[PDB]
């Protein structure tokens, strides 16, 4: 008779992925405070997205706002673009929606 908090369902995905990268046995008490770290990151992440959108004069959040954030984070540099990072870390089905490629009569999707 299981009952699961929907909020904990989302965090459980990244918590398991954490144990894959660690490559060390990890104590149970370390698990839940990583969950504590994640929600703090999400809260502060959303706050930053407000200002960058607000500065541009549009309330809607567009991808180039996310590019601007990651450049300040140091993830995106002159050599490593946004397209390069998607290729390395995301599956094929997610790649089609994000990165545009021309095919079948020079048709490009998404339009860029």
């Amino acid at each position: 008779r299981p009952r699961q908090d929907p909020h904990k369902a989302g965090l459980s995905h990244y918590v398991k992925l954490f144990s894959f990268y660690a490559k060390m046995p990890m104590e149970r008490k370390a698990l839940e405070m990583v969950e504590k770290c994640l929600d703090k990151y999400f809260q502060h992440l959303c706050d930053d997205l407000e200002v960058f959108a607000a500065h541009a004069g549009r309330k809607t959040v567009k991808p180039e706002d996310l590019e601007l954030l990651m450049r300040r984070q140091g993830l995106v540099t002159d050599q490593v673009s946004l397209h390069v990072l998607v290729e390395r870390h995301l599956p094929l089905e997610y790649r089609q929606l994000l990165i545009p490629c021309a095919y079948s009569g020079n048709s490009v999707f998404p339009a860029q």
Binding site: P25, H44, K59, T60, Q73, H89, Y94
Partner: protein, 88 residues
């Protein structure tokens, strides 16, 4: 294996992202906004690189103290450096 300590995951779960979860969490915190249809995926990418950073820093602290099991004081120390670095 004891309940208290969890062994490293040999096989990663399917790389499918929880798109529904990201939309609601972004919705409740800032209801007034609307996010573009593909913006959820990029947020998922941003979260991966954060967790990847957190795992590397925690491992170094555990090895520095000559500990074979990652402990809570190791990861909290990792959190302080990464969280400030993660904000830009």
């Amino acid at each position: 294996m004891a309940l208290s300590t969890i062994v490293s995951q040999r096989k990663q779960i399917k790389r499918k992202a929880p798109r529904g979860f990201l939309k609601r969490v972004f919705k409740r915190k800032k209801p007034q906004l609307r996010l573009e249809k593909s913006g959820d995926l990029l947020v998922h990418l941003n979260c991966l690189l954060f967790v990847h950073r957190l795992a590397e820093e925690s491992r170094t602290n555990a090895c520095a103290s000559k500990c074979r099991v990652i402990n809570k004081e190791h990861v909290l120390a990792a959190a302080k450096v990464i969280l400030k670095k993660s904000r830009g």
